[PDB]
Amino acid sequence: DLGKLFFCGFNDFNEEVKEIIRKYRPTGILIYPGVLSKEYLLMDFMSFLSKEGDFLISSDHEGGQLEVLKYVPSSPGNLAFGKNSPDVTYRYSRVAGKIMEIVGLNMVFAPVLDLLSDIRSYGSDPKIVAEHGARACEGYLEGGVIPCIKHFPGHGKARETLPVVDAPFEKLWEEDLLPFRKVLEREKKVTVMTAHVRYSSIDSLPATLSEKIITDVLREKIGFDGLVISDAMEMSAVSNNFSVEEIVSLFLNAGGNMILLGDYRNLPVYYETLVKLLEDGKVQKDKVERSIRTVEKYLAFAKKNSGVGFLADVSMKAVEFLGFEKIDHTSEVTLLVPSSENLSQADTTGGDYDQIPEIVSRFFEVENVVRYTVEDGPEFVEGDLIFDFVADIPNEKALKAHLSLPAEKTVYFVLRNPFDVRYFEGRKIVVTRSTKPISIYKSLEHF
Amino acid sequence: DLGKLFFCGFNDFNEEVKEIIRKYRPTGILIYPGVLSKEYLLMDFMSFLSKEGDFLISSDHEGGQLEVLKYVPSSPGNLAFGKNSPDVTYRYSRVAGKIMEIVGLNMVFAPVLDLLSDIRSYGSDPKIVAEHGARACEGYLEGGVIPCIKHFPGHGKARETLPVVDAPFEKLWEEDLLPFRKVLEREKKVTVMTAHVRYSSIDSLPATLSEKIITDVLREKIGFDGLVISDAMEMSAVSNNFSVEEIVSLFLNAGGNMILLGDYRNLPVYYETLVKLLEDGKVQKDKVERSIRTVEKYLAFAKKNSGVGFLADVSMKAVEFLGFEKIDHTSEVTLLVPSSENLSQADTTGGDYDQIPEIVSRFFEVENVVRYTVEDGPEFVEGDLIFDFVADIPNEKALKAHLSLPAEKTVYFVLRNPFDVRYFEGRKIVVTRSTKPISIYKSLEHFL
Numbered sequence: 001d002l003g004k005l006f007f008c009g010f011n012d013f014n015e016e017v018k019e020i021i022r023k024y025r026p027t028g029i030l031i032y033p034g035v036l037s038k039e040y041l042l043m044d045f046m047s048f049l050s051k052e053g054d055f056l057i058s059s060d061h062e063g064g065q066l067e068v069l070k071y072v073p074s075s076p077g078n079l080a081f082g083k084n085s086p087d088v089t090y091r092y093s094r095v096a097g098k099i100m101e102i103v104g105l106n107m108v109f110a111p112v113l114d115l116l117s118d119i120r121s122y123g124s125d126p127k128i129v130a131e132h133g134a135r136a137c138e139g140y141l142e143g144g145v146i147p148c149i150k151h152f153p154g155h156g157k158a159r160e161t162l163p164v165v166d167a168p169f170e171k172l173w174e175e176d177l178l179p180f181r182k183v184l185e186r187e188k189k190v191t192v193m194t195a196h197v198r199y200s201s202i203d204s205l206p207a208t209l210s211e212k213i214i215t216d217v218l219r220e221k222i223g224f225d226g227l228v229i230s231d232a233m234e235m236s237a238v239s240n241n242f243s244v245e246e247i248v249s250l251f252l253n254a255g256g257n258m259i260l261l262g263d264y265r266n267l268p269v270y271y272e273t274l275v276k277l278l279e280d281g282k283v284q285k286d287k288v289e290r291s292i293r294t295v296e297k298y299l300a301f302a303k304k305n306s307g308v309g310f311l312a313d314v315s316m317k318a319v320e321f322l323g324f325e326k327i328d329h330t331s332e333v334t335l336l337v338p339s340s341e342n343l344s345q346a347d348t349t350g351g352d353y354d355q356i357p358e359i360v361s362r363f364f365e366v367e368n369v370v371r372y373t374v375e376d377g378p379e380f381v382e383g384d385l386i387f388d389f390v391a392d393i394p395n396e397k398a399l400k401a402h403l404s405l406p407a408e409k410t411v412y413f414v415l416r417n418p419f420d421v422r423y424f425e426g427r428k429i430v431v432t433r434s435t436k437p438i439s440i441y442k443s444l445e446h447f
Numbered sequence: 448d449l450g451k452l453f454f455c456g457f458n459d460f461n462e463e464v465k466e467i468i469r470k471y472r473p474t475g476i477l478i479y480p481g482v483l484s485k486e487y488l489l490m491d492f493m494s495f496l497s498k499e500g501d502f503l504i505s506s507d508h509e510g511g512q513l514e515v516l517k518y519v520p521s522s523p524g525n526l527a528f529g530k531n532s533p534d535v536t537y538r539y540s541r542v543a544g545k546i547m548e549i550v551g552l553n554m555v556f557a558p559v560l561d562l563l564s565d566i567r568s569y570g571s572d573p574k575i576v577a578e579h580g581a582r583a584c585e586g587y588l589e590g591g592v593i594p595c596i597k598h599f600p601g602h603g604k605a606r607e608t609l610p611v612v613d614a615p616f617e618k619l620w621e622e623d624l625l626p627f628r629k630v631l632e633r634e635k636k637v638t639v640m641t642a643h644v645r646y647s648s649i650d651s652l653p654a655t656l657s658e659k660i661i662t663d664v665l666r667e668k669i670g671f672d673g674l675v676i677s678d679a680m681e682m683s684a685v686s687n688n689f690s691v692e693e694i695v696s697l698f699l700n701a702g703g704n705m706i707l708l709g710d711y712r713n714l715p716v717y718y719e720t721l722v723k724l725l726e727d728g729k730v731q732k733d734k735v736e737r738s739i740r741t742v743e744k745y746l747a748f749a750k751k752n753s754g755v756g757f758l759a760d761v762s763m764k765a766v767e768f769l770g771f772e773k774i775d776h777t778s779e780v781t782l783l784v785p786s787s788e789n790l791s792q793a794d795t796t797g798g799d800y801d802q803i804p805e806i807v808s809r810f811f812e813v814e815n816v817v818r819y820t821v822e823d824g825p826e827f828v829e830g831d832l833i834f835d836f837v838a839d840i841p842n843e844k845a846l847k848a849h850l851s852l853p854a855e856k857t858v859y860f861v862l863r864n865p866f867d868v869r870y871f872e873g874r875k876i877v878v879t880r881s882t883k884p885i886s887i888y889k890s891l892e893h894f895l
Binding site: 032033034039043060064065066067068070071072073074075076077079080081082083084088091092095098099102103116118119308310311314315317318345346347348349416417432433434435436438439 | 458479480481486487490507511512513514515517518519520521522523524526527528529530531535538539542545546549550563565566755757758761762764765791792793794795796863864865866879880881882883885886
């Protein structure tokens, strides 16, 4: 139940992350560049989430200034789009959505409806902002991702730890809030992210922590009853001014639904805080169930597809182990990595070899990497454990170099043609049928 | 008319490329990493093709070993997939197809139906290769792109300028062609690429140029009356052993439809060889007009959207020029480009500024680059032409530094907040609403 109320950022994928997700079951999964820029990890992560349950998976891929998804054509951004027809915004959004879906994302942290008063905004004109945001939201929706409008009730006027807007509510309602009204009044399956700002006309609390704003204006005045999510609670604007206990309770009591933690590593403290609040009766249980239900309702209509995780399975299924069940964590391994013989523009082999050291380092302590050329084979070396990555064996000379290695403690990764197994009768062999990072990554993971 | 007969590879996009394309009207545009890896070029190229006509836009994105499109999730490759359900191959091909489509490609040079005898083949058992091949072709078509099976009738056994396969035609028919048969009689909407191999059981000529293979084994025996495309004719296996004249003739007369020039620069030569061979009667007019029709057929069912091209237009449209309409292309520009700090991993403005000199290099033969810190302003600088790219103006000492620059030679690029314009009253100003390469590129083009 309580994991539904949490949205977590991940900058890596590893046993710790797996553990946290299994232990607390947070529904919200925000994936950052430390995962995304390493497509084998992204694929594994998605494979894992596929098997583990039912998640809202998001990114900060707004287009323009903030772009993290390689898969999605680069956008000049919202301010550019602000001078075009809202139809094209619909167009870009529907493409981003579609690609996001294929990849496996089912939510996006966008569009920004804050006003200019910079390139992250559609513009200074409230109507134009609303027109674009609305079409943006339908685009994303039709593409396959639940969007998220930010930052309610509008961050555009703010001034500096917790920034402050002193516009009177009337001004706020006609200008900053307009796009939020239009969008919510027209699109339903939309989430809303709250602003870490003090609106000195209406509450001393930051909007994120204000019931006046979330309840009185968002839920009531505008009558929005969908998912409300915080900005990241570690940001200085709130974390420097409030205890975790204050934060968790104020937000939930204000009507918020999901707490966003930019750092998954903060979940055990936040979750246990909430457990306590429920025991204290300081957070009314009905408010928690309402949010769980709201969360599950979005969960229900979000797309649920393996995304890119299927590619991790394809890869794993092609691998063969020959001559061993497994081996153990030896602090160090020496890696014999063949040099990038091919320099043709479309061939990716070279880079794949370049990545091997870092892949391996997720499982062992590489300690030593030495590069060797294919035609000679590798130069004899000694170490506790030795991985010899094999591309091809072109000649008896090389073949010998490869076999001079201590059979008791080398593992040959037959990366290309499996019929190179023949050259290692009665030795320890990993047959990937590819040089790709993911194939190598999955192998090691299966020790 | 006969631009339909040509497929040309482009590793760049520029005034020459545009000129070849308008002059001769090649149907097939094959785009290489030289353009793909520079997204703003990819965009302007698609925008251009879009305004100019109706093409077959393809890439060598096989997946696995050969990957060229950032947009497509990487794949472990056909050999890996060959140990998987054919359904997954269908699955990949479809997502790959659907992405190519969004981007603006409407064809792909895959799958490889060649047998293993490595990582680019589905495997050694032809049964398996057949299944995966057809599933793949189905996938790509479902997604929006016409595939191209290759290389007909199969490179797998090539013994290594012009390789030879000496297998009995029966072994061929039973093994290497098995997949070509299976895909080809299930999916008429496919295309076929020819192999630069000599099959000694059939012909002394390479398949690319063999009427015994293209007409007798493919068009008649198999049944295939769709698109036949050459492997690239500059490849030595044909370049070293035959002349342009023989090449254009043997191929077209063998029943091949599109001639692939790896290097679009060989077009003028190849093109005029054909127009002469037509006057000479050394090339059968029936086949030329037949091929033109086959090509138009495929074209008429290929997807047509501008793809990523619209993003060029969107970027262009958000730009205003203020205080001039055009500037004389001087010999050198000096670029004042802001330097960038520690910022979120998600923020691309910094990488964007780094990219400005390569962009401007496309329009100037010499350039002095100086990097200034936004908070200080630009150090005073001289040049025939100065481009002052402005992120923002936080202080007065800095605004001063920007303003001390000479107003008849310096162009200010207001990259972010268009409010900033006010400061540069009456001066020459480019208001992009983006730090993105494409916006800066589009601006320069427009004032030259």
